[PDB]
Short mmCIF file of C-alpha atoms and ligand atoms in Angstrom, two decimals:
data_model
loop_
_atom_site.label_atom_id
_atom_site.label_comp_id
_atom_site.label_asym_id
_atom_site.label_seq_id
_atom_site.Cartn_x
_atom_site.Cartn_y
_atom_site.Cartn_z
CA UNK A 1 -0.51 -25.16 -16.36
CA UNK A 2 1.26 -23.30 -13.27
CA UNK A 3 2.00 -19.97 -13.04
CA UNK A 4 5.53 -19.36 -11.95
CA UNK A 5 6.05 -16.49 -9.85
CA UNK A 6 9.80 -15.13 -9.44
CA UNK A 7 10.38 -12.17 -7.02
CA UNK A 8 13.94 -10.75 -8.11
CA UNK A 9 16.15 -7.88 -7.83
CA UNK A 10 15.29 -5.44 -9.95
CA UNK A 11 18.29 -4.80 -11.78
CA UNK A 12 18.15 -8.65 -13.07
CA UNK A 13 14.84 -7.90 -14.98
CA UNK A 14 16.06 -7.42 -18.40
CA UNK A 15 18.18 -10.44 -17.94
CA UNK A 16 14.92 -12.73 -16.51
CA UNK A 17 13.09 -11.02 -19.78
CA UNK A 18 16.13 -12.39 -22.17
CA UNK A 19 16.43 -15.92 -20.82
CA UNK A 20 12.57 -16.68 -20.81
CA UNK A 21 12.19 -15.01 -24.85
CA UNK A 22 15.45 -17.08 -26.13
CA UNK A 23 13.27 -20.42 -25.08
CA UNK A 24 10.15 -19.05 -26.45
CA UNK A 25 7.82 -17.70 -23.49
CA UNK A 26 7.40 -14.48 -24.57
CA UNK A 27 4.42 -13.77 -22.60
CA UNK A 28 5.02 -12.31 -18.62
CA UNK A 29 3.33 -9.95 -16.03
CA UNK A 30 5.16 -7.90 -14.24
CA UNK A 31 4.71 -5.78 -10.70
CA UNK A 32 6.77 -3.49 -8.83
CA UNK A 33 7.14 -4.66 -4.96
CA UNK A 34 8.94 -4.71 -2.03
CA UNK A 35 9.94 -7.73 0.49
CA UNK A 36 12.54 -8.91 3.18
CA UNK A 37 13.38 -11.79 4.48
CA UNK A 38 17.63 -12.22 4.97
CA UNK A 39 19.00 -9.48 3.35
CA UNK A 40 18.84 -5.65 5.12
CA UNK A 41 19.64 -3.02 4.35
CA UNK A 42 22.11 -0.06 4.67
CA UNK A 43 17.16 0.13 7.74
CA UNK A 44 14.05 0.40 5.68
CA UNK A 45 13.42 -2.07 5.69
CA UNK A 46 11.30 -3.41 2.70
CA UNK A 47 13.77 -3.00 -0.35
CA UNK A 48 12.57 -2.65 -3.78
CA UNK A 49 11.96 -6.16 -6.14
CA UNK A 50 10.50 -7.24 -9.38
CA UNK A 51 7.95 -9.97 -9.54
CA UNK A 52 8.00 -11.59 -12.72
CA UNK A 53 4.69 -13.99 -13.65
CA UNK A 54 4.93 -16.47 -16.35
CA UNK A 55 1.63 -18.80 -16.75
CA UNK A 56 3.68 -21.56 -19.01
CA UNK A 57 2.35 -26.04 -19.26
CA UNK A 58 2.89 -28.20 -17.03
CA UNK A 59 6.19 -30.34 -18.68
CA UNK A 60 8.05 -26.60 -19.10
CA UNK A 61 7.79 -25.62 -15.74
CA UNK A 62 11.75 -26.80 -14.61
CA UNK A 63 12.66 -25.44 -18.06
CA UNK A 64 11.08 -21.81 -16.94
CA UNK A 65 12.36 -22.08 -13.21
CA UNK A 66 15.91 -23.29 -14.76
CA UNK A 67 16.06 -20.07 -16.87
CA UNK A 68 15.28 -17.26 -14.22
CA UNK A 69 17.42 -18.90 -11.75
CA UNK A 70 20.55 -19.13 -13.90
CA UNK A 71 19.38 -15.58 -15.16
CA UNK A 72 18.56 -13.67 -11.51
CA UNK A 73 21.26 -15.12 -9.30
CA UNK A 74 24.13 -13.52 -8.14
CA UNK A 75 24.84 -16.13 -4.77
CA UNK A 76 24.46 -13.04 -2.53
CA UNK A 77 21.16 -12.85 0.00
CA UNK A 78 18.48 -11.29 -1.77
CA UNK A 79 18.35 -12.77 -5.12
CA UNK A 80 15.04 -13.57 -4.13
CA UNK A 81 12.48 -16.35 -5.18
CA UNK A 82 10.01 -18.28 -7.30
CA UNK A 83 6.94 -20.13 -6.30
CA UNK A 84 4.71 -22.45 -8.79
CA UNK A 85 1.20 -22.53 -8.18
CA UNK A 86 -1.44 -24.64 -9.85
CA UNK A 87 -3.24 -22.71 -12.67
CA UNK A 88 -6.75 -25.02 -13.48
CA UNK A 89 -7.73 -22.69 -16.33
CA UNK A 90 -6.18 -20.12 -18.80
CA UNK A 91 -8.37 -18.04 -20.86
CA UNK A 92 -7.14 -16.09 -24.05
CA UNK A 93 -9.37 -12.50 -23.88
CA UNK A 94 -9.75 -12.08 -27.43
CA UNK A 95 -10.77 -15.48 -28.57
CA UNK A 96 -12.42 -16.97 -25.88
CA UNK A 97 -10.54 -20.03 -25.95
CA UNK A 98 -9.38 -21.63 -22.37
CA UNK A 99 -6.21 -23.72 -22.22
CA UNK A 100 -6.63 -26.67 -19.66
CA UNK A 101 -4.73 -29.61 -18.63
CA UNK A 102 -6.06 -32.89 -20.52
CA UNK A 103 -6.65 -34.94 -17.09
CA UNK B 1 -13.10 -21.58 -3.91
CA UNK B 2 -10.74 -19.80 -7.31
CA UNK B 3 -9.09 -16.89 -7.98
CA UNK B 4 -9.74 -15.43 -10.82
CA UNK B 5 -7.00 -13.79 -12.07
CA UNK B 6 -8.15 -11.00 -15.17
CA UNK B 7 -5.18 -9.14 -16.94
CA UNK B 8 -6.39 -6.67 -19.08
CA UNK B 9 -6.19 -3.13 -20.84
CA UNK B 10 -6.39 -0.52 -18.24
CA UNK B 11 -9.27 1.63 -19.84
CA UNK B 12 -11.26 -1.78 -19.48
CA UNK B 13 -10.72 -1.55 -15.72
CA UNK B 14 -14.27 0.52 -15.99
CA UNK B 15 -15.90 -1.93 -17.91
CA UNK B 16 -15.24 -5.07 -15.89
CA UNK B 17 -15.90 -3.70 -12.75
CA UNK B 18 -19.59 -3.04 -13.89
CA UNK B 19 -19.92 -6.21 -15.96
CA UNK B 20 -18.63 -7.86 -12.26
CA UNK B 21 -21.29 -5.94 -10.35
CA UNK B 22 -24.29 -6.29 -12.59
CA UNK B 23 -23.80 -10.15 -11.47
CA UNK B 24 -23.37 -9.58 -7.92
CA UNK B 25 -19.60 -9.98 -7.74
CA UNK B 26 -18.85 -7.21 -5.99
CA UNK B 27 -15.71 -7.78 -4.27
CA UNK B 28 -12.41 -7.25 -6.25
CA UNK B 29 -8.19 -6.77 -5.63
CA UNK B 30 -6.77 -4.63 -8.29
CA UNK B 31 -3.45 -4.06 -9.17
CA UNK B 32 -0.83 -1.82 -11.84
CA UNK B 33 0.67 -4.11 -13.41
CA UNK B 34 3.25 -3.98 -16.55
CA UNK B 35 3.24 -6.86 -19.27
CA UNK B 36 4.66 -8.27 -22.82
CA UNK B 37 3.33 -11.16 -25.32
CA UNK B 38 2.00 -11.27 -28.69
CA UNK B 39 1.01 -7.48 -28.70
CA UNK B 40 3.64 -4.89 -31.16
CA UNK B 41 5.34 -2.61 -28.37
CA UNK B 42 5.46 1.47 -28.34
CA UNK B 43 7.59 3.33 -29.82
CA UNK B 44 7.95 6.24 -29.01
CA UNK B 45 11.53 7.19 -29.80
CA UNK B 46 11.81 10.70 -29.18
CA UNK B 47 14.41 13.35 -30.36
CA UNK B 48 15.86 14.72 -28.53
CA UNK B 49 13.10 4.93 -25.54
CA UNK B 50 11.41 1.41 -26.22
CA UNK B 51 8.90 0.66 -23.43
CA UNK B 52 8.79 -3.04 -24.66
CA UNK B 53 6.24 -3.43 -21.35
CA UNK B 54 3.15 -2.10 -21.82
CA UNK B 55 0.89 -1.00 -18.47
CA UNK B 56 -1.94 -3.37 -17.99
CA UNK B 57 -4.25 -3.89 -14.74
CA UNK B 58 -4.71 -6.86 -12.99
CA UNK B 59 -8.19 -7.86 -11.69
CA UNK B 60 -7.88 -10.44 -8.56
CA UNK B 61 -11.84 -11.87 -7.93
CA UNK B 62 -12.35 -14.95 -5.06
CA UNK B 63 -15.14 -16.78 -5.67
CA UNK B 64 -17.23 -20.06 -5.34
CA UNK B 65 -15.98 -22.80 -7.75
CA UNK B 66 -19.76 -23.19 -9.58
CA UNK B 67 -19.45 -18.82 -9.75
CA UNK B 68 -16.07 -19.11 -11.95
CA UNK B 69 -17.55 -19.78 -15.41
CA UNK B 70 -19.71 -16.96 -15.02
CA UNK B 71 -16.88 -14.52 -13.68
CA UNK B 72 -14.88 -15.60 -16.59
CA UNK B 73 -17.90 -14.92 -19.22
CA UNK B 74 -18.25 -11.17 -17.74
CA UNK B 75 -14.52 -10.57 -17.87
CA UNK B 76 -13.94 -12.35 -21.62
CA UNK B 77 -17.25 -10.39 -22.72
CA UNK B 78 -16.12 -6.95 -20.75
CA UNK B 79 -12.24 -6.79 -21.56
CA UNK B 80 -12.25 -8.24 -25.20
CA UNK B 81 -11.38 -5.43 -28.27
CA UNK B 82 -10.23 -8.64 -30.14
CA UNK B 83 -7.17 -7.07 -30.90
CA UNK B 84 -3.86 -8.41 -29.59
CA UNK B 85 -3.21 -7.29 -26.04
CA UNK B 86 -6.51 -7.98 -24.94
CA UNK B 87 -4.90 -10.07 -21.80
CA UNK B 88 -5.28 -13.05 -20.35
CA UNK B 89 -7.72 -14.63 -17.11
CA UNK B 90 -6.01 -17.31 -15.37
CA UNK B 91 -7.94 -19.69 -12.38
CA UNK B 92 -6.17 -20.62 -9.14
CA UNK B 93 -7.04 -22.98 -6.49
CA UNK B 94 -8.12 -21.29 -2.60
CA UNK B 95 -8.11 -23.53 -0.43
CA UNK B 96 -9.31 -20.81 2.67
CA UNK B 97 -10.72 -17.40 2.74
CA UNK B 98 -10.63 -15.70 6.02
CA UNK B 99 -12.52 -11.85 6.64
CA UNK B 100 -10.56 -10.46 9.09
CA UNK B 101 -12.93 -8.20 10.99
CA UNK B 102 -14.79 -11.26 12.16
CA UNK B 103 -12.30 -14.06 11.58
CA UNK B 104 -15.28 -16.29 9.93
CA UNK B 105 -12.68 -18.65 7.57
CA UNK B 106 -14.78 -20.40 4.48
CA UNK B 107 -12.95 -23.87 3.73
CA UNK B 108 -14.69 -25.77 0.30
CA UNK B 109 -14.87 -29.25 1.27
CA UNK B 110 -16.27 -32.14 -2.19
CA UNK C 1 4.05 -25.04 1.03
CA UNK C 2 1.03 -22.59 0.71
CA UNK C 3 1.01 -18.62 -0.02
CA UNK C 4 -0.89 -16.63 2.74
CA UNK C 5 -2.22 -13.75 0.52
CA UNK C 6 -3.34 -11.09 3.13
CA UNK C 7 -5.37 -7.53 1.69
CA UNK C 8 -5.26 -5.03 4.33
CA UNK C 9 -5.80 -1.24 5.07
CA UNK C 10 -1.98 0.09 4.48
CA UNK C 11 -1.90 1.76 7.95
CA UNK C 12 -1.65 -1.87 9.77
CA UNK C 13 1.20 -2.69 7.56
CA UNK C 14 3.65 -1.75 10.22
CA UNK C 15 1.55 -4.17 12.98
CA UNK C 16 1.23 -7.00 10.63
CA UNK C 17 5.22 -6.90 9.55
CA UNK C 18 5.89 -7.20 13.18
CA UNK C 19 3.29 -9.74 14.40
CA UNK C 20 4.54 -11.95 11.81
CA UNK C 21 8.42 -11.48 12.54
CA UNK C 22 7.90 -11.90 16.13
CA UNK C 23 6.85 -16.05 15.47
CA UNK C 24 9.63 -16.08 12.95
CA UNK C 25 8.30 -15.05 10.19
CA UNK C 26 10.70 -12.49 8.05
CA UNK C 27 9.89 -13.59 4.81
CA UNK C 28 7.75 -11.35 2.93
CA UNK C 29 6.33 -9.81 -0.53
CA UNK C 30 4.38 -6.41 0.08
CA UNK C 31 2.28 -4.55 -2.98
CA UNK C 32 0.67 -1.56 -3.29
CA UNK C 33 -2.75 -2.44 -4.53
CA UNK C 34 -6.64 -0.93 -4.83
CA UNK C 35 -10.45 -2.88 -4.09
CA UNK C 36 -13.47 -2.80 -2.88
CA UNK C 37 -16.43 -4.89 -1.49
CA UNK C 38 -18.82 -4.84 2.05
CA UNK C 39 -16.44 -0.92 2.73
CA UNK C 40 -18.15 2.07 0.86
CA UNK C 41 -16.11 5.27 1.32
CA UNK C 42 -15.32 8.98 0.45
CA UNK C 43 -18.43 9.79 -0.65
CA UNK C 44 -16.71 12.91 1.44
CA UNK C 45 -14.66 15.60 -0.42
CA UNK C 46 -13.52 18.69 -0.04
CA UNK C 47 -13.84 21.45 -3.26
CA UNK C 48 -17.27 23.18 -2.71
CA UNK C 49 -19.00 19.71 -4.51
CA UNK C 50 -17.49 16.23 -5.86
CA UNK C 51 -18.39 13.10 -3.95
CA UNK C 52 -16.84 10.24 -6.06
CA UNK C 53 -14.17 7.38 -5.46
CA UNK C 54 -14.28 3.69 -5.98
CA UNK C 55 -11.80 1.36 -5.56
CA UNK C 56 -9.89 2.63 -1.77
CA UNK C 57 -5.91 1.50 -1.10
CA UNK C 58 -5.24 -1.24 0.42
CA UNK C 59 -2.26 -3.37 0.75
CA UNK C 60 -0.81 -6.69 -0.25
CA UNK C 61 1.19 -9.08 2.10
CA UNK C 62 2.27 -12.53 0.78
CA UNK C 63 4.25 -14.94 2.80
CA UNK C 64 5.18 -18.20 1.40
CA UNK C 65 5.17 -21.07 4.47
CA UNK C 66 5.06 -24.48 5.47
CA UNK C 67 1.16 -26.27 5.45
CA UNK C 68 1.67 -26.86 9.13
CA UNK C 69 2.34 -22.97 9.66
CA UNK C 70 -0.45 -21.35 7.72
CA UNK C 71 -3.09 -21.18 10.65
CA UNK C 72 -0.36 -19.61 13.12
CA UNK C 73 0.50 -17.24 10.12
CA UNK C 74 -3.42 -16.28 9.37
CA UNK C 75 -4.09 -15.72 13.21
CA UNK C 76 -1.47 -13.29 13.65
CA UNK C 77 -2.26 -11.44 10.41
CA UNK C 78 -6.06 -11.03 11.66
CA UNK C 79 -5.07 -9.92 15.17
CA UNK C 80 -2.87 -7.45 13.93
CA UNK C 81 -5.10 -6.11 10.72
CA UNK C 82 -8.67 -6.32 12.31
CA UNK C 83 -10.17 -2.92 13.77
CA UNK C 84 -13.43 -4.73 13.93
CA UNK C 85 -15.08 -1.81 11.08
CA UNK C 86 -16.12 -2.58 7.13
CA UNK C 87 -13.14 -2.64 4.81
CA UNK C 88 -10.21 -4.97 7.57
CA UNK C 89 -9.83 -6.95 4.34
CA UNK C 90 -9.22 -11.14 3.50
CA UNK C 91 -6.64 -13.55 3.99
CA UNK C 92 -6.38 -16.39 0.87
CA UNK C 93 -4.31 -19.41 1.02
CA UNK C 94 -3.68 -20.52 -1.92
CA UNK C 95 -1.53 -23.81 -2.45
CA UNK C 96 2.29 -23.76 -4.08
CA UNK C 97 3.63 -26.71 -5.27
CA UNK C 98 7.65 -25.77 -5.36
CA UNK C 99 9.70 -22.93 -4.16
CA UNK C 100 12.60 -22.16 -5.35
CA UNK C 101 15.30 -20.38 -3.34
CA UNK C 102 17.04 -18.44 -6.22
CA UNK C 103 20.86 -18.06 -4.45
CA UNK C 104 21.48 -21.91 -3.79
CA UNK C 105 18.57 -23.24 -6.70
CA UNK C 106 17.50 -25.36 -4.04
CA UNK C 107 14.01 -26.24 -4.45
CA UNK C 108 11.54 -27.16 -1.74
CA UNK C 109 8.63 -29.61 -3.04
CA UNK C 110 6.26 -31.75 -0.81
CA UNK C 111 6.90 -35.24 -0.15
CA UNK C 112 3.74 -37.29 -1.35
CA UNK C 113 4.02 -36.66 -5.09
CA UNK C 114 6.53 -38.29 -8.16
CA UNK C 115 8.93 -37.14 -8.85
N1 ADP D 1 8.37 -16.96 2.45
C1 ADP D 1 8.22 -15.74 1.69
N2 ADP D 1 7.18 -15.28 1.08
C2 ADP D 1 6.98 -14.49 0.51
N3 ADP D 1 7.63 -13.22 -0.21
C3 ADP D 1 9.07 -13.95 0.60
C4 ADP D 1 9.54 -15.34 1.47
N4 ADP D 1 11.15 -15.31 1.16
C5 ADP D 1 11.45 -14.31 0.81
N5 ADP D 1 10.87 -13.44 0.27
C6 ADP D 1 11.06 -12.41 -1.10
O1 ADP D 1 11.93 -12.92 -1.69
C7 ADP D 1 12.57 -11.70 -1.68
C8 ADP D 1 14.43 -11.75 -1.23
O2 ADP D 1 14.59 -12.68 0.37
P1 ADP D 1 15.34 -13.03 1.04
O3 ADP D 1 14.97 -14.17 2.23
O4 ADP D 1 16.07 -11.79 1.73
O5 ADP D 1 16.29 -13.83 0.07
P2 ADP D 1 17.09 -15.02 -0.04
O6 ADP D 1 16.49 -16.05 0.62
O7 ADP D 1 18.10 -15.20 -1.89
O8 ADP D 1 18.65 -14.45 0.71
C9 ADP D 1 12.02 -10.71 -0.32
O9 ADP D 1 12.71 -9.26 -0.53
C10 ADP D 1 10.79 -11.54 -0.56
O10 ADP D 1 10.40 -10.10 -1.86
N1 ADP D 2 1.80 -16.62 -20.13
C1 ADP D 2 1.89 -15.70 -19.03
N2 ADP D 2 1.87 -15.32 -18.05
C2 ADP D 2 1.31 -14.28 -17.45
N3 ADP D 2 1.42 -13.02 -18.47
C3 ADP D 2 0.68 -13.23 -19.61
C4 ADP D 2 1.38 -14.20 -20.19
N4 ADP D 2 1.12 -14.23 -21.74
C5 ADP D 2 0.09 -12.93 -21.76
N5 ADP D 2 0.35 -11.96 -20.45
C6 ADP D 2 -0.14 -10.91 -19.70
O1 ADP D 2 -1.26 -11.18 -21.03
C7 ADP D 2 -0.67 -9.43 -21.71
C8 ADP D 2 -1.23 -9.56 -23.10
O2 ADP D 2 -0.61 -10.75 -23.27
P1 ADP D 2 -0.49 -10.51 -25.36
O3 ADP D 2 -0.01 -12.06 -25.65
O4 ADP D 2 0.39 -9.19 -25.47
O5 ADP D 2 -1.98 -10.66 -25.79
P2 ADP D 2 -2.57 -11.61 -25.78
O6 ADP D 2 -3.63 -11.88 -24.79
O7 ADP D 2 -4.06 -10.99 -27.01
O8 ADP D 2 -2.63 -13.02 -26.69
C9 ADP D 2 0.38 -9.10 -21.40
O9 ADP D 2 1.06 -7.81 -21.44
C10 ADP D 2 0.58 -10.20 -20.02
O10 ADP D 2 0.53 -8.87 -19.38
N1 ADP D 3 -14.36 -11.59 -3.40
C1 ADP D 3 -13.01 -10.86 -3.25
N2 ADP D 3 -12.09 -11.00 -4.14
C2 ADP D 3 -10.86 -10.09 -4.35
N3 ADP D 3 -10.72 -9.58 -3.49
C3 ADP D 3 -11.32 -9.30 -2.66
C4 ADP D 3 -12.20 -9.76 -2.17
N4 ADP D 3 -13.38 -9.25 -1.12
C5 ADP D 3 -12.64 -8.35 -0.82
N5 ADP D 3 -11.09 -8.19 -1.69
C6 ADP D 3 -10.83 -7.47 -0.75
O1 ADP D 3 -10.64 -7.18 0.00
C7 ADP D 3 -10.73 -5.55 0.81
C8 ADP D 3 -11.53 -5.13 1.83
O2 ADP D 3 -12.83 -5.94 1.21
P1 ADP D 3 -14.39 -5.65 2.22
O3 ADP D 3 -15.21 -6.54 1.51
O4 ADP D 3 -14.92 -4.01 1.62
O5 ADP D 3 -14.75 -5.41 3.70
P2 ADP D 3 -14.21 -7.13 4.61
O6 ADP D 3 -13.28 -7.75 3.91
O7 ADP D 3 -14.44 -6.14 5.86
O8 ADP D 3 -15.56 -7.97 4.53
C9 ADP D 3 -11.55 -4.94 -0.96
O9 ADP D 3 -11.24 -3.52 -0.54
C10 ADP D 3 -10.76 -5.51 -1.50
O10 ADP D 3 -9.16 -5.51 -1.87
#
């Protein structure tokens, strides 16, 4: 399992949600954040961004990453980043069932 | 070490904090988030919206490898209702844990 | 790569921001959070009575860097965020397997793994 962490422009949230839902990735956690890098800033200098976290099976990562890149990109500085983090266990609170990679 | 990341119903925060404190797990970082999944969206269509991302609470607790199963069980027991939308717990590896005030760094090796 | 996750006092954000950009670490993601641990506070309030609170306001700073830059990033945050008092915060170092730049579609992975 992996956690796909995307930091995007806030106006791209609807595009990203749609692109993920279409491919069967309905579950996601969204956080309002701020950030900086190569951009700025007409500065402040921390601009509003949106963090989208999706925990998926190892084999779905490339599909999820590609779905987010395609829906969040503009080609301009400030599009954001996607960080892939290992997840050792994913537990569904209501059932107690836990998802692990067979290994 | 591991970071136990729980995404729960906001009204369960007090229950989760209590269940963790009683087992000796006092340290935690809490974030207000939104989410979607299996759970049905809120509507709310007032005349004269929508709201598909529901309010949730993220609880992050960094613990030793051997305490994970106890922390996970404490959160499942205190955050569950049995209804769609209870949330998830994700266990992420933590390689180093630094206490800013002392500069002391915890590292694991097995 | 690694994600350096620092949970600091909110008033230290500007110091941390400055100490990181000084060393060439311009990219960062900042989140407003709450927390608790060793530090206790307020426990002191105005109204004639009222003496509560639980989770104190904190700031999370996340910076994704190459493996060899971690110790420098950690030291820069420790130096700029410390007061010496309880509640200064923590730094957690988490592994990052892939780092994608959305605008170009270019993905950074660690060389030593297939594929
Ligand atoms: N090394 C990094 N660590 C953490 N977050 C980062 C990092 N670099 C960029 N970000 C995040 O991604 C957002 C966009 O980054 P930026 O460098 O300005 O975009 P881009 O590389 O597409 O031009 C930032 O506002 C910040 O939230
Ligand atoms: N794959 C996922 N990645 C990230 N967050 C998720 C994921 N699936 C669910 N969530 C989070 O858990 C919350 C509850 O998920 P939901 O599917 O509605 O119910 P349940 O936990 O009972 O399956 C969501 O609102 C979201 O915050
Ligand atoms: N085990 C932990 N897991 C997650 N967050 C923690 C943990 N311990 C501390 N924190 C975070 O760091 C902040 C400060 O921690 P605290 O123990 O009160 O003081 P100090 O960090 O100086 O030891 C907390 O308010 C919380 O946001």
